Design a protein around this ligand. Structure first.
Ligand code: A1R
Length: 265
């Protein structure tokens, strides 16, 4: 936790100073790209996403979200979109406290926090709502510079990705007070809106994963099935993306989140 906390603090300083020093000694400017990402950040309310809905190579890997994004970005020039497994309540989750989860890693490694911290309406809505289902609100963050690898090392050459920030329902907090089918409907509606936003913004290649299946305690078979219904068997997004990677990095024994996605896809 202490090493992650230190890295998080360094990233915040970097975003303030607008440059960082790579291991070679190269000083890398990022202010322009960060400012662009912030200025282009958009909050989508549920009903706007619903409007977007009125209008493929599939891989499962043990990659982190960022490792998959970096691989895809090196292979072609079209900007990749990545799903941020978001906190409903804090931009970048607990990254500044040294918390260890997917969003926190994104926030330690990129300009994502500068984008999300600029959308207080998203977080205020959920704070007032006080409901663990959260909502279909989504933050779209274009061209966010990514400048660390999985180990926290600064990159000689940063790359840019779009992020889609949407919180999965906190099934852990809900317990058995909603049915499997109710949660499935919430997941399907929300995932459809994530995909609609990605497509709306011209992203043909996506990095998805075990959304909500860690701290939020969702069932990875159900989350994998949710994406499958949308992307496969003549679903609404079948054939609409060029490349979808389910990058599932699961350090628990048996890597069960990854196993569930591998089984389905
Ligand atoms: N970096 C990364 N890449 C890919 N997959 C990952 C990664 N880190 C974890 N995982 C896998 O994805 C699963 C879900 O990750 P998690 O970050 O726990 O997402 P949640 O939606 O359940 O939790 C979110 C909340 N945690 C941090 C945020 O601030 C949100 O509060 C997790 O169980 C792992 O199997």
């Amino acid at each position: 936790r202490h090493s992650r906390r230190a890295i998080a603090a360094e990233t915040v300083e970097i975003l303030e100073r607008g440059r960082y020093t790579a291991p070679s000694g190269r000083v890398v400017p990022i202010a322009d790209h960060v400012a662009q990402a912030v200025r282009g950040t958009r909050l989508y309310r549920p009903e706007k996403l619903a409007v977007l809905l009125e209008g493929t190579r599939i891989e499962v890997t043990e990659e982190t979200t960022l490792a998959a994004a970096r691989r895809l970005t090196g292979a072609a020039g079209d900007q990749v979109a990545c799903l941020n497994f978001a906190s409903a309540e804090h931009p970048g989750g607990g990254f500044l406290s040294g918390a260890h989860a997917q969003e926190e890693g994104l926030a330690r490694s990129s300009g994502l926090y500068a984008s999300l911290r600029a959308v207080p309406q998203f977080y205020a809505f959920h704070h007032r709502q006080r409901d663990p289902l959260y909502s279909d609100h989504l933050i779209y963050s274009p061209g966010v510079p990514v400048f660390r690898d999985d180990a926290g090392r600064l990159l000689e050459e940063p790359y840019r990705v779009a992020f889609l920030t949407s919180p999965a329902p906190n099934r852990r907090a809900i317990g058995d007070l909603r049915t499997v089918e109710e949660i499935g409907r919430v997941l399907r509606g929300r995932a459809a809106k994530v995909l609609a936003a990605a497509r709306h913004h011209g992203h043909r290649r996506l990095v998805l994963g075990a959304w909500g299946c860690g701290v939020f305690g969702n069932d990875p078979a159900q989350v994998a099935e949710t994406f499958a219904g949308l992307l496969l068997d003549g679903g609404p997004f079948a054939g609409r993306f060029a490349h979808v990677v389910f990058a599932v990095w699961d350090t628990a024994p048996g890597a069960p989140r990854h196993a569930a996605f591998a089984r389905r896809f």
